[PDB]
Every structure is written in C-alpha cells, then in structure tokens.
Ligand binder design. Structure first.
Ligand SMILES: OCC(CO)NC[C@H](O)COc1cc2ccccc2c2ccccc12
Ligand SMILES: *[C@@H]1O[C@H](CO)[C@@H](O)[C@H](O)[C@H]1NC(C)=O
Ligand SMILES: *[C@@H]1O[C@H](CO)[C@@H](O)[C@H](O)[C@H]1NC(C)=O
Ligand SMILES: [Co+2]
Ligand SMILES: [Co+2]
Length: 434
C-alpha cells in the first residue's frame, strides 16, 4: 500500500529513558504510531473506500496486488478517532472512542524517527515501565510487548509497500495473524472471510508470523508474562490454515507457538498477589512498576514495585520446578503439568533467545477478544473445566465475561496508561532518570 494525506499523520511524542551500566539514565525522544489495520484504506486518487465494514471493494481490490496498487493508508486523528494521547513519558489508550464512527482500542508501535520503528535488543537488558490498569475490567487486555518486526515496516523487502512504519505497516506476532489487511506489500483480500461477530474485521488467506515477547498482558484482575518462539525468528508470511494461530482452524499447524510459556501468578496458585484493593500484594487500583530482566542464559526474571516496596515474581511450585525465574525447567514443568507441546515444539527459550538477541519493536495496545473473550487470560479456560483441572483457572473473572459487544457497551471509558519506560542493562533502570 501507499500513503495518502487527506488526513495528516502526526505521531504523538513519547519519551523514555535509556540507562547505562555506569548508573545514569538519559532521556530519549520517540513517538507512537497506530497500526495500519486501524486506518482508513482508500483509493489513491479519491475518497472511495478500498475496505469498509468487513468487506473489500471488489473493483478496487480484485486481487492482492491490484488492491495494493490502487489503495492507500491515510493518517490518524490519534485523540479524536482512536482515544490515544501522550504526555511526556506517559501514553494513554481509551477503549471505545466515539467520533463520526465507533473505534475500539488501538495497537501502537514506538518509533525512532517519523519513518522508522525503535528497536530494542532485550538480551542482557531489562525493561521497566509503570502501568495503571485500574480502569481495565474482565475481558480487556492492556498489553505491552515486543515483536520481531522490521524497522522500516517491510518497505525494503516489499517495495509495493511505500507507506511503511510511518503508517504502522509490517506487523507480525506469534498468532501469525490473518486479520491484517496488508501483508508483504500486498492486500489480504484473496481468501477474505468477514468475521461472523465483528462488523469491522475478517480473516484473509495470508498471515504474518514472528516471535513475540509478551512482557505484559493484563487487566485489573489478571496478568501474565509470556514468551512465544517461532521457527523463523522474524517477520514471515504464512499461507492460510498453514499459518496456525488463533486465526486458523488448527492453532498448532504452523511456525509459531501461539500459546507460549506463560507465567501467571494466579494460574500458578498465588491468588492473593495481584488484584483490586488492599487484600492483594499488588493493588491494581493504583499504579505499579513492572521490571523484566532478560539474563543471557535465556531465562526471564521479574520484579514489581508499588509505593516503594519491591516484590520479586512470586515463587511457584509446579511438578519438580520450584522458583520464580521463568526458565527451561519452568516451561517444561508447565507443559508436563498443564499440558501442551507448542512451546517446546518451537524450540523453547533457546529458540526464543534468538529473538531477544536481535532487535524487537515495542508494541502497546488495548483490545478485547472476539475469539475467546479473554478467558485464557483472566477466567477458567476451557470454560467446561474446573479448578480440579491443573492450570484451568487463570483468574477470577466469570466464564461469562468479556463478550466484546457487552464490554464495549458497559465499559467504553475503560483505558490503560503506560508510563515511565526505562531500558538498559540488567540492574540499571532503578537509577535516577536523566
Ligand atoms: O496482547 C497482545 C497479543 C497480540 O497478539 N498477544 C496474544 C498472544 O499471542 C496470545 O494470543 C492468544 C492466545 C489465546 C489462547 C487461548 C485462546 C485464545 C487466545 C487468543 C485469542 C485471540 C487473540 C489472541 C489469543
Ligand atoms: C503470594 O506472593 C506474595 C509475594 O511473593 C507472597 O508474599 C505471598 O505470601 C504469596 N501468597 C501465596 C498464597 O502464595
Ligand atoms: C471439556 O470439554 C473438552 C472438549 O469437549 C473435553 O476434552 C474435556 O474433557 C471437558 N472437560 C470436562 C471437565 O468435562
Ligand atoms: Co499466497
Ligand atoms: Co538466572
């Protein structure tokens, strides 16, 4: 796709701290850009939609190549259309935003320049941020995560994409998402199936795969930390059901692990660690700090700070694993006790280390789940299971929660705020911001 300019594109600025082993931090100035799927896609020479509702123009988009030639992405009104605001080091994402039309959520990338994504090499480093999840009820996911995207959004590889990172192209993750309207500089109109329960989305014949580091998927009730390896580390197109992922009839028929090695303290048995009010170790009515450390072994360590009190990730015992480090032994014990072979099939933390050794793009999002109502994160899943099924209970939300139309109707003013991002060598991010 190309870029059009009927609406101007001004990325909301966002600063963050880069810290060094010598004990100081220095401010970086970036910005955020919304993913291309949220944008208006229209004819290059008019205001005629190439995509509208959940169907493509059969004349502008008779096939993937012709579509990309005929069509462009336009700019985003971040606050008024998408409910996205920034202030200094803080980013807020609103849930439902009513303008001339209804918008739900956003997926945003941190940029290095107005035309390039910021890369982060996670291995040997740590990432800290503050979050307010107080306005996130059951069924919502305020997410902060990393994916192995190209810094240009795919332009160098696919010259029929001239819009690039400036317009949020190039996304991929471990679901090999097939809901993307453009992949590899071609549209995804071929094989398009409009969603049965979402007026705005569908699934196409291509998907876009890559490694995914879910540092934070959470609401006020539940939170999880989940690496997802893929056999190809970076962005790679996939074909139809061969994609695997939640967008395919077989979730395990592909190159990526769509489940991951999740660490959810509630799911592991500590139901008192995280939740709303003073009965929990971490009170989700209040801002908290989340620090995630990627030691060179490939294991992941985690601690939290709230009101100046520090808590490591709580200890868990699962099979013969005992501890609070997300390592090989944890992930293997998890598969043994809870089930599954996706994470290990895709090479586990050894394969994941290839992703964190390289560059990854920072993603911040707010979303509801039209496939499984976020029950996999904050409820009992599958919903016919009980607490007697190991790992089935991931949070205290009702198995009836998270119906998108319902949460959109009941909780439109839900929001997530991410702030005070700091990144640097392990041990460095608690030192003073510059
Ligand atoms: O929060 C960021 C998100 C980006 O894709 N990470 C999701 C991350 O890959 C696990 O994804 C899912 C995992 C999942 C597991 C069981 C049931 C359903 C799902 C599901 C349904 C819809 C969408 C995603 C999932
Ligand atoms: C949950 O984790 C916190 C922090 O590690 C700990 O203090 C608390 O005692 C744990 N409770 C349970 C039930 O495991
Ligand atoms: C839940 O349903 C699935 C598929 O129908 C089945 O495999 C599983 O045994 C069920 N569990 C219970 C507790 O009945
Ligand atoms: Co194809
Ligand atoms: Co260690």
């Amino acid at each position: 796709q190309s870029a059009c300019t009927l609406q101007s594109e001004t990325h909301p600025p966002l600063t963050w701290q880069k810290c060094s082993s010598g004990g100081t931090c220095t401010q970086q100035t970036g910005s955020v850009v919304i993913d291309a799927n949220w944008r208006w896609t229209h004819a290059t020479n008019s205001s005629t939609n190439c995509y509208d509702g959940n169907t493509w123009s059969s004349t502008l988009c008779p096939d993937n190549e012709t579509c990309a030639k005929n069509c462009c992405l336009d700019g985003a009104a971040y606050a008024s259309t998408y409910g996205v605001t920034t202030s200094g080091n803080s980013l807020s994402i609103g849930f439902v935003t009513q303008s001339a039309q209804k918008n739900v959520g956003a997926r945003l990338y941190l940029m290095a320049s107005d035309t390039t994504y910021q890369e982060f090499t996670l291995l040997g480093n740590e990432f800290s941020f503050d979050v307010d999840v107080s306005q996130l009820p059951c069924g919502l996911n305020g997410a902060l995560y990393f994916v192995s995207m190209d810094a240009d959004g795919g332009v160098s590889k696919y010259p029929t994409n001239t819009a690039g990172a400036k317009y949020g192209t190039g996304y991929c993750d471990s679901q090999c998402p097939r809901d993307l309207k453009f992949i590899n500089g071609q549209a995804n109109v071929e094989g398009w199936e409009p969603s049965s329960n979402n007026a705005n989305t569908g699934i196409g014949g291509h998907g876009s795969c890559c490694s995914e580091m879910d540092i934070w998927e959470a609401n006020s009730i539940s939170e999880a930390l989940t690496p997802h390896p893929c056999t190809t580390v970076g962005q790679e197109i996939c074909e139809g059901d061969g994609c695997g992922g939640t967008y395919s009839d077989n979730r395990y028929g592909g190159t990526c692990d769509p489940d991951g090695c999740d660490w959810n303290p509630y799911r592991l048995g500590n139901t008192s660690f995280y939740g709303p009010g003073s009965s929990f170790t971490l009170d989700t009515t209040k801002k908290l700090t989340v620090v995630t450390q990627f030691e060179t072994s490939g294991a992941i360590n985690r601690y939290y700070v709230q009101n100046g009190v520090t808590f490591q990730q709580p200890n868990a015992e699962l099979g013969s694993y005992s501890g609070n480090e997300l390592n090989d032994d944890y992930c293997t014990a998890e598969e043994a006790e809870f089930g599954g072979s996706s994470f290990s099939d895709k090479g586990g933390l050894t394969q994941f280390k290839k992703a964190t050794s390289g560059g990854m793009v920072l993603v911040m999002s707010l979303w509801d789940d039209y496939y499984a109502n976020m029950l996999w994160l904050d409820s009992t899943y599958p919903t016919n299971e009980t607490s007697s099924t190991p790992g089935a209970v991931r949070g205290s939300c009702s198995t009836s929660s998270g119906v998108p139309a319902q949460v959109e109707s009941q909780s439109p003013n839900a929001k997530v705020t991410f702030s005070n991002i700091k990144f640097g060598p392990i041990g460095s991010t608690g030192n003073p911001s510059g």
